[PDB]
């Protein structure tokens, strides 16, 4: 029943022609609401969910300024990282970071995150106390020392308890019909004979929101963890997700197998068999 505002930020040194030096996407839960980027120093912003049409013009003007400022600061951060890691000039490197706040059903704050990565690996993380940091190496330990000597987490908490809460509250109100919901999965088993003579049973789940789901196959009394093929949960493109899991089974044994579906929109696990 909790809800989160999350931003996924990426900064690239030496992107390709036409490719962003800085891009960030913002989500509430599993619904994207905007894109921001900067290409050759030009900032651009696009809405992605319907409630964003209710934002006023100063939201987008303040956001444009924030994009310019963050893009310059991230570029400068990339240059310092290059030097502290004694890396060569001329290559392209990647700095990513995630910013989030989370509230419960009474709209009370539960937590928040700030975490950064260099070239695809953890670099520094804010701990759940929202006051201290965890580093991975001696360069990120310099960062930790600077942030703690400066008290920088204070300004992050000011962002969490100010603008993060402000926007999460307003987006949940204006986007209530999209965001305060759980669509349950529509489930079924499909059956595909194989040329060898055995059968693929493929348990499908479609139309569900949010994305988190579990699909499991089980036999009369045998464990199938190592036997089933599971696909990564995937967007259908209209706001809902889909997934499947399959096992290959001998012909004539199909009713021995049951597929179980677990999802927030269900009160108990769905249990499906073929046919």
């Amino acid at each position: 029943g909790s809800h989160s505002l999350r931003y996924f930020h990426t900064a690239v040194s030496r992107p390709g022609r036409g490719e962003p030096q800085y891009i960030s996407v913002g989500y509430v839960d599993d619904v994207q609401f905007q894109r921001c980027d900067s290409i050759e120093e030009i900032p651009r912003m696009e809405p992605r969910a319907p409630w964003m049409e209710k934002e006023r013009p100063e939201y987008w003007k303040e956001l444009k300024l924030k994009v310019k400022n963050i893009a310059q600061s991230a570029r400068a951060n990339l240059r310092t990282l290059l030097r502290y890691y004694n890396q060569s000039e001329g290559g392209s490197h990647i700095l990513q970071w995630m910013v989030s706040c989370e509230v419960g059903p009474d709209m009370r704050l539960l937590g928040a995150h700030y975490q950064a990565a260099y070239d695809g690996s953890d670099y520094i993380t804010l701990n759940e106390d929202l006051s201290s940091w965890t580093a991975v190496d001696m360069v990120s330990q310099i960062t930790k020392s600077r942030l703690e000597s400066a008290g920088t987490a204070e300004y992050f908490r000011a962002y969490v308890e100010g603008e993060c809460l402000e926007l999460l509250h307003r987006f949940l109100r204006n986007g209530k019909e999209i965001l305060q919901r759980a669509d349950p999965p529509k489930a079924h088993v499909a059956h595909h004979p194989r040329p060898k003579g055995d059968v693929t049973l493929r348990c499908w789940a479609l139309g569900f929101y949010p994305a988190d789901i579990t699909l499991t196959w089980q036999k009369d009394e045998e464990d199938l963890t190592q036997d089933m093929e599971l696909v990564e949960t995937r967007p259908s493109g209209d706001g809902t997700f889909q997934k499947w899991a399959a096992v290959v089974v001998p012909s004539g044994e199909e009713q021995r197998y049951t597929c179980y579906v677990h999802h927030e929109g269900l009160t108990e696990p769905l249990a499906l068999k073929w046919r």
Binding site: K66, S73, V99, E163
Partner: peptide, 7 residues
């Protein structure tokens, strides 16, 4: 929409 300069 927040960034911390790490160095």
């Amino acid at each position: 929409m927040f960034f911390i300069n790490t160095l």
